């Protein structure tokens, strides 16, 4: 049975996962209580007399956000101790989440994964959700990915993690925590999907016509991206994509697995009727630079591998037609050794809309997720942020004191700089 364990780490992962699991109840008709009034087996586990519990854990060192789910509208959905809390948060410190206050809770968290793996018949992959700018997402996220790689070998991992933006970030020491999370993000995650905060601020402002959005609006259409990714396992379609289908079709190299993401039809409630949505029309909007989930410029790099997910009433003629137009557009450039460049997965389920959501009811959709050499620009500006910070050893006495050595900053920067060398040489003309 196609079925996926999803893990959410840190304060960003819970609120992303709160809107993620809000959405997953709507495709399968699950009530907030947890009782339905065979597609549900991917995310929800049938328990006894008509009770569907999620295949998820909510681990976080800070109890201030886990209890909000516990007292919120979805208290009865989750298992009482799948949601794992702690005493004190990491508080923007990779040392705390990895060495001091991460060790107590990682063993408790790994015990829940073994029991979730026993329930699932054929396990297909893991999805992580964390923020590299925070302490818990970086620190506790790194240790879990270190442990799960050893215990569960050769298992697919799809990394949905939030990066700092070049212009907007909510704290001071995001550059320190991001580069330390990078050393475990390369080796121990088979696929990493780039996500950024204020790139979706631009999406909400110019497409959803929301002048003053919050984090709750962002997490609902991040949820729409991941739900479009996993929609092929749950629902029947013309061309299906698995979790293992993504990896041997998108990443060519072990050290290159970071990739962008775009959800193309984004219209507010009052813009639904007057707009026309053709298959090639939205696919044109998928490759637009302003409609990407991160602040990359794909014109600077080259689309080195690409993928497409379609939902709803999309014929396989129009996907083959629209790919043909994108390939011969001069603005979008491919790497020279990738003649074919796409994966097309068409699902026959239209995208469900959250009641009270910002998105309107759309018949057809795109989830464009592509690997490009332009992602080195994200790792470059973030490395300059660490460069101008580490120059005079600022905010280092925190990291030295509770566990980490000084020399592991050297390894994290060197591994990041070697990654930048790889993105430049692979996209080079041969």
């Amino acid at each position: 049975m196609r079925e996926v364990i999803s893990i959410h780490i840190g304060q960003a992962g819970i609120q992303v996962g709160n809107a993620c699991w809000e959405l997953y109840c709507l495709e399968h008709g699950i009530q907030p209580d947890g009782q339905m009034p065979d597609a549900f087996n991917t995310f929800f586990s049938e328990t006894g007399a008509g009770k569907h519990v999620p295949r998820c854990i909510f681990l976080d060192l800070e109890p201030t956000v886990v209890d909000e789910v516990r007292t919120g509208t979805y208290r009865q959905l989750f298992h009482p101790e799948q949601l794992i809390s702690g005493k004190e948060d990491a508080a923007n410190n990779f040392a705390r989440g990895h060495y001091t206050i991460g060790k107590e809770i990682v063993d408790l968290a790994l015990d829940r994964i073994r029991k979730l793996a026993d329930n699932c018949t054929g396990l297909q992959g893991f999805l992580v959700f964390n923020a590299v700018g925070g302490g818990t997402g970086s620190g506790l996220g790194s240790l879990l990915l270190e442990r799960l790689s050893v215990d569960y070998g050769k298992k697919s991992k799809l990394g949905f993690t939030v990066y700092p933006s070049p212009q907007v970030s909510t704290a001071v020491v995001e550059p320190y925590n991001s580069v330390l999370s990078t050393h475990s993000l390369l080796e121990h995650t088979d696929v990493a999907v780039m996500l950024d905060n204020e790139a979706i601020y631009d999406i909400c402002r110019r497409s959803l016509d929301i002048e003053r959005p919050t984090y709750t609006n962002l997490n609902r259409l991040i949820a729409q991206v991941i739900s479009s990714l996993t929609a092929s396992l749950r629902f029947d379609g013309a061309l299906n994509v698995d979790i293992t289908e993504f990896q041997t079709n998108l990443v060519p190299y072990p050290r290159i697995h970071f990739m962008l993401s775009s959800y193309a039809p984004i219209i507010s409630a009052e813009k639904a009727y007057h707009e026309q949505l053709s298959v090639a029309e939205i696919t044109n909007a998928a490759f637009e630079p302003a409609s990407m989930m991160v602040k990359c410029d794909p014109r600077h790099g080259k689309y080195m591998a690409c993928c497409l997910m379609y939902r709803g009433d999309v014929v396989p003629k129009d996907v083959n037609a629209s790919v043909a137009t994108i390939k011969t557009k001069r603005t979008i450039q491919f790497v020279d050794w990738c003649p074919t460049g796409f994966k097309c997965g068409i699902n026959y389920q239209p995208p469900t809309v959250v009641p009270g959501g910002d998105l309107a009811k759309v018949q057809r959709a795109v989830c464009m997720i592509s690997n490009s050499t332009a992602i080195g620009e994200i790792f470059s500006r973030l490395d300059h942020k660490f460069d101008l910070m580490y120059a005079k050893r600022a905010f280092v006495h925190w990291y030295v004191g509770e566990g980490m050595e000084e020399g592991e900053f050297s390894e994290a920067r060197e591994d990041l700089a070697a990654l930048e060398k790889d993105f430049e040489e692979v996209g080079a003309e041969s």
């Binding site: 300059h384 460069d387 120059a391 020399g407 050297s410």
Partner: peptide, 19 residues
């Protein structure tokens, strides 16, 4: 970028001096 890379090279080469 070049300055910080050679600074880390200097630091790890100065680790060799200590032994």
């Amino acid at each position: 970028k070049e300055k910080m890379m050679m600074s880390l090279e200097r630091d790890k080469l100065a680790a060799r001096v200590d032994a």
